[PDB]
């Protein structure tokens, strides 16, 4: 039931590695301070997303055993998880407690950022569904590691090697769910179920960005590799 010493070591190591990201306050303070045009928000998005890719590669490299995987499989895992990890991190920031009325303004500002209405409803439905799970910091860090170490990604040659790296993270998350929320025995299953909803953001990620209400969609060379954009 309780975490073993090795699992406690793994958990604190994943947490330390995950904490190298930008502070949620830095991100939300900028959006809440003043309203920006769709052009200004697109530029904020590309800068934020390019920095997230860099942080994600650094976190991924720290995952136990990731460096021992086949080099082509490493690329496939990174490319297959980058968009999902960016949305899961946006969902985490969206659901951080802010003073009265601030989350309403944050939501209204994102709704009016330049993104098309067809993508707003599935995006907020996911952020709100994530928020109802009342996830802790450790749960977001482990879920992000689980999303990266998905053995079912397209182009993965050695799935078993990936399964072996993912299995101890799933074991730790399941124990945490049983500890954090003993009143809700479905908590682990609902966290894993949300991972299925997260995968839907892959199919339309390129269309979401290209349909942003701006004249020119200029991306960075690193985003062009990770996203399916020119």
């Amino acid at each position: 039931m309780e975490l073993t010493p090795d699992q406690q070591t793994l958990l604190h190591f994943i947490m330390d590695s995950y904490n190298k990201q930008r502070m949620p306050q830095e991100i939300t303070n900028k959006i809440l301070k003043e309203a920006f045009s769709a052009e200004e928000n697109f530029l904020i998005l590309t800068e934020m997303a390019t920095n997230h890719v860099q942080v994600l590669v650094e976190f991924t490299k720290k995952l136990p055993g990731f460096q021992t995987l086949d080099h082509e499989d490493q690329i496939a895992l990174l490319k297959g998880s980058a968009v999902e990890a960016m949305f899961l991190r946006s969902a985490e920031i969206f659901n951080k407690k802010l003073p009265s009325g601030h989350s309403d303004l944050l939501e209204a500002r994102i709704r009016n950022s330049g993104i098309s209405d067809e993508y707003i409803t599935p995006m907020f439905s996911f952020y709100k569904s994530i928020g109802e799970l009342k996830m802790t910091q450790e749960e977001y860090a482990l879920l992000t590691a689980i999303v990266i170490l998905s053995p079912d990604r397209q182009y993965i040659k050695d799935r078993e090697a990936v399964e072996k790296l993912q299995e101890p993270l799933l074991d730790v998350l399941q124990k945490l769910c049983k500890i954090h929320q003993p009143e809700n025995p479905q908590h682990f299953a609902c966290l894993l179920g949300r991972l299925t909803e997260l995968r839907t953001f892959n199919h339309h990620h390129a269309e979401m960005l290209m349909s942003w209400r701006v004249n020119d969609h200029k991306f960075t060379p690193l985003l062009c590799e990770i996203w399916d954009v020119q």
Binding site: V57, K61, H71, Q74, I75, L222, E225, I226
Partner: peptide, 12 residues
């Protein structure tokens, strides 16, 4: 090609 990703993965 994913040359920037490959570079970020293979550095250090």
């Amino acid at each position: 090609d994913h040359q920037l990703l490959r570079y970020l993965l293979d550095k250090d």
